[PDB]
Amino acid sequence: XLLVTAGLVLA
Protein backbone atom coordinates (compact mmCIF):
# COMPACT_ATOMS: atom_id res chain seq x y z
CA UNK A 1 0.00 0.00 0.00
CA LEU A 2 1.30 3.51 0.84
CA LEU A 3 3.84 3.49 3.70
CA VAL A 4 7.28 5.13 4.12
CA THR A 5 9.25 2.66 6.27
CA ALA A 6 12.96 2.05 6.82
CA GLY A 7 13.79 -1.68 6.74
CA LEU A 8 10.58 -3.71 6.19
CA VAL A 9 8.60 -1.96 3.42
CA LEU A 10 4.94 -3.04 3.50
CA ALA A 11 2.04 -3.00 1.02
Next chain:
Amino acid sequence: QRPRCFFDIAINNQPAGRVVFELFSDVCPKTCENFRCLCTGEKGTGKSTQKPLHYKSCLFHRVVKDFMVQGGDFSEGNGRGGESIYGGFFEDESFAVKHNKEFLLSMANRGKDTNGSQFFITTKPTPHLDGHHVVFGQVISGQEVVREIENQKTDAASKPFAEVRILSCGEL
Protein backbone atom coordinates in the same frame (compact mmCIF):
# COMPACT_ATOMS: atom_id res chain seq x y z
CA GLN B 1 14.22 31.98 12.03
CA ARG B 2 13.40 29.04 9.78
CA PRO B 3 16.44 27.54 8.14
CA ARG B 4 16.70 26.79 4.45
CA CYS B 5 18.61 23.78 3.17
CA PHE B 6 19.37 22.44 -0.30
CA PHE B 7 20.21 19.35 -2.32
CA ASP B 8 21.90 19.45 -5.73
CA ILE B 9 20.60 16.32 -7.49
CA ALA B 10 22.05 14.13 -10.24
CA ILE B 11 20.22 11.35 -12.07
CA ASN B 12 22.71 8.82 -13.48
CA ASN B 13 25.46 11.38 -12.82
CA GLN B 14 23.70 14.04 -14.89
CA PRO B 15 22.87 17.22 -12.88
CA ALA B 16 19.13 17.68 -12.56
CA GLY B 17 18.99 20.88 -10.48
CA ARG B 18 18.63 22.11 -6.93
CA VAL B 19 15.85 21.41 -4.42
CA VAL B 20 15.55 23.97 -1.62
CA PHE B 21 13.64 23.26 1.60
CA GLU B 22 12.33 25.47 4.37
CA LEU B 23 12.39 23.73 7.75
CA PHE B 24 9.66 24.36 10.35
CA SER B 25 12.04 24.80 13.30
CA ASP B 26 9.32 26.60 15.23
CA VAL B 27 7.19 23.40 15.14
CA CYS B 28 9.72 20.55 15.07
CA PRO B 29 13.10 21.93 16.22
CA LYS B 30 14.84 18.69 17.10
CA THR B 31 13.71 17.13 13.80
CA CYS B 32 14.76 20.19 11.81
CA GLU B 33 18.18 20.38 13.49
CA ASN B 34 18.86 16.74 12.58
CA PHE B 35 18.04 17.33 8.91
CA ARG B 36 19.96 20.62 8.81
CA CYS B 37 23.05 18.97 10.26
CA LEU B 38 22.78 16.00 7.87
CA CYS B 39 22.85 18.57 5.05
CA THR B 40 26.05 20.23 6.33
CA GLY B 41 27.81 17.15 7.71
CA GLU B 42 28.83 19.22 10.74
CA LYS B 43 28.16 16.57 13.40
CA GLY B 44 30.78 14.13 12.08
CA THR B 45 30.42 10.35 12.42
CA GLY B 46 27.28 8.50 13.33
CA LYS B 47 27.61 6.58 16.60
CA SER B 48 26.10 3.25 15.57
CA THR B 49 26.79 3.46 11.86
CA GLN B 50 30.36 4.80 12.09
CA LYS B 51 29.73 6.63 8.81
CA PRO B 52 29.47 10.36 8.20
CA LEU B 53 26.21 11.99 9.31
CA HIS B 54 25.94 13.59 5.92
CA TYR B 55 23.59 13.50 2.94
CA LYS B 56 26.40 14.17 0.46
CA SER B 57 26.47 11.32 -2.03
CA CYS B 58 23.30 9.85 -0.47
CA LEU B 59 20.65 8.32 -2.73
CA PHE B 60 16.89 8.67 -3.12
CA HIS B 61 16.49 4.93 -2.78
CA ARG B 62 12.69 4.59 -3.05
CA VAL B 63 10.29 6.32 -5.45
CA VAL B 64 6.56 5.73 -5.86
CA LYS B 65 4.78 7.80 -8.51
CA ASP B 66 1.78 9.71 -7.18
CA PHE B 67 2.94 9.07 -3.59
CA MET B 68 6.43 10.22 -2.52
CA VAL B 69 10.17 10.05 -3.02
CA GLN B 70 12.37 8.79 -0.15
CA GLY B 71 16.05 9.13 0.67
CA GLY B 72 18.57 9.73 3.43
CA ASP B 73 19.95 6.23 4.06
CA PHE B 74 23.58 7.32 4.12
CA SER B 75 24.90 4.04 5.53
CA GLU B 76 23.21 1.37 3.39
CA GLY B 77 21.52 3.24 0.50
CA ASN B 78 18.53 0.95 0.56
CA GLY B 79 16.24 1.87 3.48
CA ARG B 80 17.78 -0.44 6.05
CA GLY B 81 20.37 2.02 7.33
CA GLY B 82 20.58 5.53 8.63
CA GLU B 83 20.80 7.17 12.04
CA SER B 84 20.16 10.55 13.60
CA ILE B 85 22.73 13.08 14.80
CA TYR B 86 21.68 12.25 18.38
CA GLY B 87 22.84 8.65 18.18
CA GLY B 88 20.35 6.05 17.04
CA PHE B 89 16.82 7.39 16.72
CA PHE B 90 14.76 10.18 18.27
CA GLU B 91 11.15 10.61 19.28
CA ASP B 92 8.30 11.86 17.11
CA GLU B 93 8.16 15.53 17.99
CA SER B 94 4.87 16.93 16.61
CA PHE B 95 1.93 15.79 14.55
CA ALA B 96 0.63 19.33 14.09
CA VAL B 97 1.51 19.71 10.39
CA LYS B 98 -0.70 17.63 8.11
CA HIS B 99 0.38 15.61 5.09
CA ASN B 100 -2.24 17.46 3.08
CA LYS B 101 -0.30 18.51 -0.02
CA GLU B 102 2.53 17.71 -2.35
CA PHE B 103 6.10 18.81 -1.64
CA LEU B 104 6.05 18.38 2.13
CA LEU B 105 9.19 17.05 3.84
CA SER B 106 8.49 14.34 6.43
CA MET B 107 10.39 11.67 8.35
CA ALA B 108 10.48 8.07 7.24
CA ASN B 109 10.69 5.62 10.15
CA ARG B 110 10.30 2.02 11.28
CA GLY B 111 7.56 2.59 13.79
CA LYS B 112 6.89 4.87 16.72
CA ASP B 113 9.82 7.01 17.87
CA THR B 114 12.30 5.72 15.30
CA ASN B 115 13.38 8.90 13.48
CA GLY B 116 16.88 8.52 12.00
CA SER B 117 18.14 10.16 8.83
CA GLN B 118 15.57 9.02 6.26
CA PHE B 119 13.01 11.43 4.87
CA PHE B 120 10.43 11.63 2.15
CA ILE B 121 9.00 14.38 -0.01
CA THR B 122 5.30 13.96 -0.73
CA THR B 123 4.21 14.19 -4.35
CA LYS B 124 0.46 14.06 -3.55
CA PRO B 125 -1.42 14.41 -0.27
CA THR B 126 -0.68 11.50 2.08
CA PRO B 127 -3.11 12.15 4.95
CA HIS B 128 -3.04 8.58 6.23
CA LEU B 129 0.54 9.23 7.39
CA ASP B 130 -0.67 11.87 9.87
CA GLY B 131 0.22 10.71 13.38
CA HIS B 132 2.75 8.22 12.02
CA HIS B 133 5.38 10.44 10.35
CA VAL B 134 6.52 13.89 11.44
CA VAL B 135 6.18 16.62 8.81
CA PHE B 136 8.95 19.15 9.38
CA GLY B 137 9.47 21.19 6.21
CA GLN B 138 8.50 21.95 2.65
CA VAL B 139 10.05 22.42 -0.78
CA ILE B 140 10.34 26.10 -1.74
CA SER B 141 12.11 25.66 -5.12
CA GLY B 142 13.08 22.81 -7.35
CA GLN B 143 9.63 21.22 -7.45
CA GLU B 144 10.37 20.21 -11.04
CA VAL B 145 13.45 18.30 -9.86
CA VAL B 146 11.29 16.42 -7.37
CA ARG B 147 8.87 15.58 -10.21
CA GLU B 148 11.75 14.26 -12.31
CA ILE B 149 12.83 12.00 -9.41
CA GLU B 150 9.20 10.89 -9.00
CA ASN B 151 9.03 9.87 -12.67
CA GLN B 152 11.98 7.46 -12.57
CA LYS B 153 11.42 3.85 -13.56
CA THR B 154 12.05 1.61 -10.56
CA ASP B 155 13.08 -1.94 -9.67
CA ALA B 156 11.16 -4.48 -7.63
CA ALA B 157 11.97 -2.60 -4.40
CA SER B 158 10.86 0.70 -5.94
CA LYS B 159 14.50 1.80 -6.21
CA PRO B 160 15.20 3.89 -9.33
CA PHE B 161 17.16 2.08 -12.01
CA ALA B 162 19.01 5.40 -12.66
CA GLU B 163 20.96 6.55 -9.55
CA VAL B 164 19.32 9.61 -7.93
CA ARG B 165 22.18 11.08 -5.93
CA ILE B 166 22.64 14.14 -3.77
CA LEU B 167 25.84 15.58 -5.33
CA SER B 168 26.06 18.39 -2.82
CA CYS B 169 23.95 19.72 0.03
CA GLY B 170 23.99 22.32 2.75
CA GLU B 171 22.34 25.28 4.40
CA LEU B 172 21.58 28.64 2.78
